[PDB]
Amino acid sequence: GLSKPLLELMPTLGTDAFTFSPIRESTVSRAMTRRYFADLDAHAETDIVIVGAGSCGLSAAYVLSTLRPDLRITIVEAGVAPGGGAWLGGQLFSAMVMRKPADVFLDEVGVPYEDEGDYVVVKHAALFTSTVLSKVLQRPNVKLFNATTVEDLITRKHKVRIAGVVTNWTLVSMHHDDQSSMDPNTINAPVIISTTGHDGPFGAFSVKRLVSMKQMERLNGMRGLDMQSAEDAIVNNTREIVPGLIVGGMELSEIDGANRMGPTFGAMALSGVKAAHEAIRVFDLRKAQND
Amino acid sequence: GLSKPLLELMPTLGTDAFTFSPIRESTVSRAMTRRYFADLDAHAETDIVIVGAGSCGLSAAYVLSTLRPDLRITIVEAGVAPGGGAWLGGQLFSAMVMRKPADVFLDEVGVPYEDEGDYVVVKHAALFTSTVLSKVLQRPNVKLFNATTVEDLITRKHAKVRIAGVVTNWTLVSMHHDDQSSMDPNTINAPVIISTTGHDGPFGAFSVKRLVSMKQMERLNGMRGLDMQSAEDAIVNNTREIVPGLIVGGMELSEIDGANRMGPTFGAMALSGVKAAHEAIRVFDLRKAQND
Amino acid sequence: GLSKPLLELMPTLGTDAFTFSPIRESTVSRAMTRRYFADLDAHAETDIVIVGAGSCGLSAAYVLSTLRPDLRITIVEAGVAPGGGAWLGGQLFSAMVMRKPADVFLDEVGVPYEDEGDYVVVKHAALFTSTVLSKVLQRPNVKLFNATTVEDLITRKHKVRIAGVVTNWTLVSMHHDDQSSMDPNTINAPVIISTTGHDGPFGAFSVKRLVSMKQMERLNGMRGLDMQSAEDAIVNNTREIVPGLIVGGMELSEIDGANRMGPTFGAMALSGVKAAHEAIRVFDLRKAQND
Amino acid sequence: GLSKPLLELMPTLGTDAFTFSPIRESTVSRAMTRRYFADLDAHAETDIVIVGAGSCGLSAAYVLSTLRPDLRITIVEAGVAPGGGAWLGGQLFSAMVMRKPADVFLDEVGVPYEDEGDYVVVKHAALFTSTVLSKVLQRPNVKLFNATTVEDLITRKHKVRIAGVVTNWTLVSMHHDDQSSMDPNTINAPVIISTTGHDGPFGAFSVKRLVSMKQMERLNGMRGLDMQSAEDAIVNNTREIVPGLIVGGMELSEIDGANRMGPTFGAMALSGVKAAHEAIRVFDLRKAQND
Amino acid sequence: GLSKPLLELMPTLGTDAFTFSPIRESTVSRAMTRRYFADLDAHAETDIVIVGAGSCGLSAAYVLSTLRPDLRITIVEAGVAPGGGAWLGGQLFSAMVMRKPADVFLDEVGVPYEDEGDYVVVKHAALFTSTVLSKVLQRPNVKLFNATTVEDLITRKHKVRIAGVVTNWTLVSMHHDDQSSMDPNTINAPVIISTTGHDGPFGAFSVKRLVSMKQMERLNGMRGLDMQSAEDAIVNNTREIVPGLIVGGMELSEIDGANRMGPTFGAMALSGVKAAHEAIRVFDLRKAQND
Amino acid sequence: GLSKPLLELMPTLGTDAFTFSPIRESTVSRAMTRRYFADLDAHAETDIVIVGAGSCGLSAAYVLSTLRPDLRITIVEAGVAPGGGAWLGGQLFSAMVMRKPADVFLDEVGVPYEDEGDYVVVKHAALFTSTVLSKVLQRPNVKLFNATTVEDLITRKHAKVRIAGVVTNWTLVSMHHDDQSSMDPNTINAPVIISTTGHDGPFGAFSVKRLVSMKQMERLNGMRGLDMQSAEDAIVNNTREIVPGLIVGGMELSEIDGANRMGPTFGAMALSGVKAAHEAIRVFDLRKAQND
Amino acid sequence: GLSKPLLELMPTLGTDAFTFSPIRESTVSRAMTRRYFADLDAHAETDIVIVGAGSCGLSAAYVLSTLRPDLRITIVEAGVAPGGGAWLGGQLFSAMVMRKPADVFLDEVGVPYEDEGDYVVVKHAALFTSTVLSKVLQRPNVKLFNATTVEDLITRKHAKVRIAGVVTNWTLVSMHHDDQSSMDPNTINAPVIISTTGHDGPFGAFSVKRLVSMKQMERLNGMRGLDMQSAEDAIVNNTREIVPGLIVGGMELSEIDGANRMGPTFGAMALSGVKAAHEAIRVFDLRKAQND
């Protein structure tokens, strides 16, 4: 049941006996700003940046921060609420289906499921996302800059190497026409993991920018749905696309022209894992090239 | 560190040695549709409904499902992503400030914080919401119907009315009752309905605004100015059954009561939800008897 | 005249003597969800999927389900209301004009008309569409999923073969930016009939998808209006375009680069009959390939 | 099975042997215009106008044209497709629930159903709608002006009497700003049956217009959902609200402050039957005054 | 001064002595539809069609109807108000400037002006347009179908020959999404004069359509503003682009890749004069081929 | 047949022989700006202002300028193309129906028609509008400020007020008073304003609605149902000075008066403008005196 | 301290002892139109035109009018408010960072800063823009046509072309060539045109995008990733006459050269402006001749 303290408080609610401690509005403001600037300052030069906090990005943020408490992890998520397209299953339904061996990841992060043999099923996709999300955030080396969009990549010569991200408020990135000029800010980082999902108004950002930066010819383009070949491809091909830039999740399907998997998350999760692994493998090198 | 099983799997990713088990698409479909219908069939008739998965509603769901595992709790949230305004702090910033004694609740749900004196600060608003959400979604007596909007209330006579459930529909359908032909809603019968849809706005403050148009209220006193000290006490202390079968809490309450807003501080949303759950339990049997 | 039971009921309406049997909301909600998820389950794996419930789609569904009571036909229509663009004639006018021998089909589905010589005229385009819709829906093996949009195609290797469709609620398909990620659902099928009208926000989906999937050179494009050359072209060329994918109706004009016919439905109707014949010709084989 | 004629034509589809009879585009334009304007001419002055071709209106239309084949019935429907909100059940599902004795009506029009006791269930709302639609449109005295909106009512003194409708193309009604002035057209009629659903951008037209013309104190507005009291109310209180104006269906709930029922069409059917009945009762009187 | 009849009526206004003759709404309705049907029926098959009632098209309509009373001239104008960009000069100002010898045309149509030497200035652009428009509309052989758009062209083999235009209500052409399918209407003609202004949403229709029909490599595109080199170009090159299709006005600039003149209308007027000539030159031959 | 000069020019078109006289863009620019700003200067202070170049406003302007060549007439029309809803008949059809004795006016403005006994029919609404528009613009004492919107009224005391001019701006600016930073309007002082802006709507019934928001009117009775027979009479017969310096006519009148609507018929609009012009003249001297 | 005249006036405010001098609306209207025409008439044919009043354009305008009081400078700014993206720093913040020697330019226009070694910081970007802006507008040979958009260019031959002016229109009109009937643009003839319209977007990078649509450029390399060190030197040292009559600078140049972007750092903009003004002088006599 409930904790004794909370049980002792409840009877108090709705009576003169209950009242919150005194507060001045400036206190709250400063409590927030002082802390946000701290983060903003400390992450202007970070170790690893993760663009897009969906099922894949979060799964990467988890593995990475657990194996490397020594590294600073800056997650830049466009929406106010993180989680990408993992709050639902298919056609607005709830059940999250993960084909084995993705269950190995569900165990790791402590997310229950029904075993069906070749695949497992999480009660609600929300349960998976909220749980993983909750744990990632507990990590002292992780910072979630939600409500923030990546408008461009910080580049360098040698062919180019990605060395950071150009950020701004998601709402600003969306109205660069509905106001006067609003310049973005930056984040210097040796390694960037992009998991912004597939092509769309917001998705497939890093992969599409490489093309506009005339570094890529074109995008093969996410192909039709074929669960069996899709998940396999996304997970095994998750890697450093260009120096300093690692791609995973469905964004990868855009650059590689892989099939899509529809309402099944095994690949996203393990692709998250693969990406964290890649970041580690490539880190020391890019770190040297960035300093 | 990571678990052995995962540490052993990692080296496999990126090699021909890795492959997911076989799967036929329709197995995925049926896997979801089967379970979803079950929910839809089971919750068509439920015990308690909570409208609005914002910080207040979630806190209510937590306390309620914990205290009454015997009760079926149906959470209906408009957005795909649940959490309301609990994903951020103030002005798009992160820090979640909670005035004491709300820290008692934080301890209850296991959410770390920095003791600052009269108030405490949670590293990130997101840290609180995901934790509570995670714990709530783990109770076997709770179901989250996200991307689902409450378009109306199910009423009963005693011209006074009793709220006996909600009229539902896919949020996307609610937002486009013009861009298409007629799309009727669905229903959920329930003895007690908790409404925590936040304050007035395109989507928010549904129940309260509906009571007015159903001609059960003279109008809404409307949310007033920001005064944290008087706002949080007012909200928490007055969470209650506003009309038979309907309890209001959170910022939706400020609209009918005409209370001040508190802005970027979540103590009241948490304890108001605690009180919302307490009220539900106090009233359940009575409404449950009246409803059947 | 009316039936006696109804004539007997009428005097009742408007009096205390009239009342509906008792009911509980949960009863109705269950009557619906139970039956829907039942279809949803039974059609996850189907025999023939018809994309687009317009004059062509409908015509094909009619002939098909009539000739093969054994096959399960899944009609996936985008709009809430079916009927495509066959509710009107031209420029918001009613009269539906069909050139012979399209009248043989109008005789099949029992739709009255005026014989003007080389063509026949249906009183209102709505008379055809409603009658046909009514008859197709009465078939025990036909299921209509209206408000459901086809977002992609389920593919398989060998060049590719179409093995089904990727589905979602039309209102979701239209707002993949007005919310967080919302994954689609799916339906497996050996043969898919696509009749989604010519290019536009909604139309010519299959053929456009074949291009964006990098399976087609480009769309020849729907050409000018020339009824005589157009109708013969749509009808005589309706066929399996790729293993498992049959295209007819005006969508066909997008890939074949045929002329348009404006306000005349003979071709749409007979293209439907042709599409039906094609599904049958090609069925057993694609079926074997898909199991 | 199919008809021999159609079975004999099918093999021909897809061969040089097949070809549509000669045609010239101007023949198709004239075929439609000549007819559409014949209707415009005959209906400019009609016997009964029914606004909104939804389940309630379509039902009323069915009974009115069958009982009085002598009267000209003019149906004005805003949408391109008629049927209102009777193409689906609730939350986009298909099953149409009808509480008894509404099954007597389903018997009348020939729409099959499963008997569940107090209520019967029609396979798919569309089957009911398309079926009834087909029959109404078959009547020689009925005319469906779809894609046409009622923007106002024609009035006369003695308080006022409703004597017709002000019409226009729906698209014009929706864009009285996106262009220069576009005047409406007219249809004189002694009795007007308004069945345009509950309030919304399109709905509850005549009921709201009475208010704006300062004839009504206001709209009590549709109340909460309560199937048992809503349907009994809507059906029993369908009547002539003002001389010349008979309101039924869900539009009546706005002026009466009646509860809503949701995904159940029992009332819409019988309110329609009763609206038609009231039409007949009041016809001679209004016709005498209108002339 | 006013006319005696009017002067005698005036004092009557605002007194009980003034009243309009008896009317019934249906009378007015029938007065319009009957004449519109007549027009819609007589023009389904016409001699010459002019797309776009702007300064250029209108000039062409004038000259063409005046030199050939025997021919039927069908003007299809998208906007509700005809005139295109000739209701104003540049930057919302009023003065209409025409370089000589354009003044020769102004003399012809009876439009006063100030001579400045190389150019003449018309008091207000509206003056020119209202006068030409008034004279064009007076001709017994001219019909103005405004509020109507040309969505496509009618084609014939032999490369293709333009034999008419696909029409629809402008509002319907702008919302082929915001509703169900709405088929267009047709008009057969041996020669079509397109003067739909330069590129944009509505503009440069026929030229752009020649590309989408794979008849043109691309549009050279309207170039920079060089009044002196542009107007001569527009005028001297106005001619039959494809058999049956004459392009003039600024639309011509799109296909020829010519400079623009901005706020000066000599070219437009003389281009129209030229257009009418081409139609006459080419008429008998096209007429022959089209029948 | 065509003129000889034109007939001699046609053969030239299409040959290297045809060419336009020399020109410098700036010459054209100055040709326009000079004249326009001349208009702005002269009309800033005018005699009579007509807001709304519709069938009623145009008829009023025609009668006014013809009976009073001495007065300066300033027409302010929101649309780029003037003519309001006088380009079409009903439901996008052409024919323009005018009941008698409006035909007396059609003879005045030189517009042909088919006599049907109790009413006459003009070939195309457009014929009427373009013809009248043409004869109005020709008068030397009239200026047409198209693409210009009247956003407010200029007032003076005798609390009762007197309308003494219009507040103006480019229509495009009137519709985007958010889509940019602040954009102040301009002004036109005038002792008499004839407002003929049609019935309520985004653009319509400007003055009548403004009188209300200026708290000089209780509320608009609002345009009523359609009844041609009683509507036209009421519109023509009650056209007049509603308030000192403000004459209202056409369909804007039905909004304040609460009169029926006539739909696809124009007799009343035409004779209303005629009455509007008669009233301006009756009232002019008095208002002018007060205004100076 | 304030001025004595103002100090003596204040006590008057809020008493019957205060009142403005008499006025008649028409007077204010004529005071504005009269002057606007003067400008419109004098600039139709001008010396140097600067498209885009952003930081770069503004800087160019300053340097140019200060070195050539004899030249008439016509600035066309699409927005109501000038200044471009120079009202803020990055992510909506204030501080304007300029890397040296860009500080030389701030000393010239009198804008304070904190020296930080290799760079300096102007309190708020608004200080730089407002100061520069103020100083530029004071110049008697400068004219700011704000709320005005360059829809196209004036071209001449020597298929090589020369730029000889700009096709103009009210910005709001430029944005609605579909929301009305045809609205022709006006013109401005000039020998040299400095285009500084920021980088690609609905309004940005105009001349550059136009050179391509006019079929004078193979394509646009497109602005590349953010790399401040290579970006700023590149934009500044490559600012030049791209085509006879057209000088390009600021961030627009990045579109045509495929140079890196610099983000929230304005050093390059200011010195790119100085460079553009300089190029215009170097090129002026020659183009002036070619234009007459």
Ligand SMILES: [Fe+2]
């Ligand atoms: Fe930028």
Ligand SMILES: [Fe+2]
């Ligand atoms: Fe509804």
Ligand SMILES: [Fe+2]
């Ligand atoms: Fe997706």
Ligand SMILES: [Fe+2]
């Ligand atoms: Fe109107």
Ligand SMILES: [Fe+2]
């Ligand atoms: Fe079409």
Ligand SMILES: [Fe+2]
């Ligand atoms: Fe203002």
Ligand SMILES: [Fe+2]
């Ligand atoms: Fe233009």
